[PDB]
Design a protein around this ligand. Structure first.
Ligand SMILES: *[C@@H]1O[C@H](CO)[C@@H](O)[C@H](O)[C@H]1NC(C)=O
Ligand SMILES: *[C@@H]1O[C@H](CO)[C@@H](O)[C@H](O)[C@H]1NC(C)=O
Ligand SMILES: *[C@@H]1O[C@H](CO)[C@@H](O)[C@H](O)[C@H]1NC(C)=O
Ligand SMILES: *[C@@H]1O[C@H](CO)[C@@H](O)[C@H](O)[C@H]1NC(C)=O
Ligand SMILES: *[C@@H]1O[C@H](CO)[C@@H](O)[C@H](O)[C@H]1NC(C)=O
Length: 360
């Protein structure tokens, strides 16, 4: 059956650091191969002709079917899989690597679908020209996507390629298409993650894009849902700019590592945030990214209580959540106990008995 996000709910993880590279998720990989760069773009340019071979090895090893087995053993029902635009098109001028990403995407997705019945969110994290000035949007310092007709044309070709992948998957009812991630045009980094990170001028271009995508997907298969990561606005900001019959679910992201909160007081914040992001009911809401690290006083002991309290909150007020991220080994210190790898690594929660998603 095709998924209807006004009734469907699921709990799962992101597969971060696998087909999109980021410095924080694997400290050992980034130290060895980045050459000092802070984005995937610069890591790849630094490696030159060796970029492909290195990344192809990572695609084959960082996430495998054994990792999927471990996720299923606790009842994970949804995988959010970030990809770069370079997995889908070969953009002239780009320093991101265009290789066999979709071959690994299919092997892993087919397995999670066939063996365990999981749903797959295919996330196009970056778009040609850059959507947010950050590595995840294309490259550090790139905001060239906005108002750029050439970049717009290439972006729709990206979506055409995702549509075909879903249509020829053998199970198109298993996929949700997410055509962008965290678009922002505000250069002040202290306002990232907040509504002011996207101007109204930039929002008109985002709306142009998301309506073009809604129409293009529906023209091929009106049953494939579209997931709109509407930057850091509330769903109510977008809901009256879109026809009610769009097959549309909103993806909101909720983090706490730069907010004045402690591990002790985190559950109150998790419940408040899920309540305020529940939306107006014209379209449903999914919490596609979250994590339990707080800015202050991080506590090993409270990890089990806090991750389970987040799962509770996002399932009660919304359609569920995907943790960031499945596997994480970055060793940056945090305030209080430990490093980020003690709080962003979903595998540790599974391995130490914190997770039983069948209780929902
Ligand atoms: C999803 O369910 C809602 C509520 O019944 C309905 O209005 C909507 O048309 C359904 N989606 C599709 C694609 O039929
Ligand atoms: C973090 O991990 C990297 C990779 O193993 C290592 O080179 C570095 O020394 C570590 N940093 C700290 C502060 O432990
Ligand atoms: C990518 O996949 C194709 C199709 O199997 C294969 O022929 C090619 O050698 C692969 N390239 C790399 C770099 O693995
Ligand atoms: C427009 O987008 C293209 C495609 O990525 C990019 O190469 C170019 O630099 C962009 N132009 C501007 C002015 O940002
Ligand atoms: C964070 O909050 C605590 C109490 O909630 C307050 O004492 C502290 O000053 C705040 N931090 C900053 C930087 O204002």
């Amino acid at each position: 059956e095709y998924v209807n996000w006004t009734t469907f709910k699921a709990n799962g993880v992101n597969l971060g650091g696998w087909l999109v590279q980021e410095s924080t998720i694997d400290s050992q990989f980034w130290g060895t191969y980045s050459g000092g760069a802070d984005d995937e773009w610069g890591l790849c340019e630094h490696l030159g002709s060796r970029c492909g071979p290195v990344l192809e090895h990572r695609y084959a090893t960082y996430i495998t079917e054994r990792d999927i087995d471990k996720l299923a053993s606790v009842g994970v029902g949804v995988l959010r899989i970030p990809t770069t635009y370079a997995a889908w098109i070969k953009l002239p001028g780009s320093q991101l690597y265009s290789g066999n990403q979709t071959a690994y995407l299919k092997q892993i997705a087919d397995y999670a679908i066939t063996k365990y019945g999981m749903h797959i969110i295919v996330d196009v994290h970056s778009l040609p020209g850059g959507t947010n000035g950050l590595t995840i949007g294309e490259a550090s310092g790139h905001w060239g996507w906005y108002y750029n007709e050439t970049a717009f044309d290439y972006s729709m070709q990206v979506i055409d390629a995702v549509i075909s992948f879903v249509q020829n998957s053998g199970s198109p009812q298993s996929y949700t298409i997410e055509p962008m991630n965290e678009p922002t045009d505000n250069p002040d980094m202290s306002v990232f993650g907040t509504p002011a990170a996207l101007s109204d001028r930039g929002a008109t271009w985002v709306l142009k894009y998301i309506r073009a995508v809604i129409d293009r997907v529906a023209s091929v298969n009106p049953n494939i849902p579209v997931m709109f990561q509407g930057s850091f606005k509330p769903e109510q900001y977008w809901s009256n700019q879109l026809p009610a019959d769009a097959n549309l679910v909103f993806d909101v992201h909720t983090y706490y590592f730069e907010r004045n909160v402690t591990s002790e007081t985190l559950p109150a914040r998790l419940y408040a945030d899920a309540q305020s992001k529940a939306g107006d009911g014209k379209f449903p809401v999914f919490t596609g990214e979250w994590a339990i690290q707080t800015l202050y006083q991080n506590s090993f002991a409270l990890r089990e209580r806090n991750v389970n309290a987040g799962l509770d909150a996002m399932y009660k007020y919304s359609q569920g959540s995907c943790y960031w991220t499945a596997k994480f080994s970055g060793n940056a210190t945090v305030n209080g106990q430990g490093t980020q790898a003690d709080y962003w690594n979903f595998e540790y929660f599974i391995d130490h008995g914190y997770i039983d998603l069948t209780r929902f």
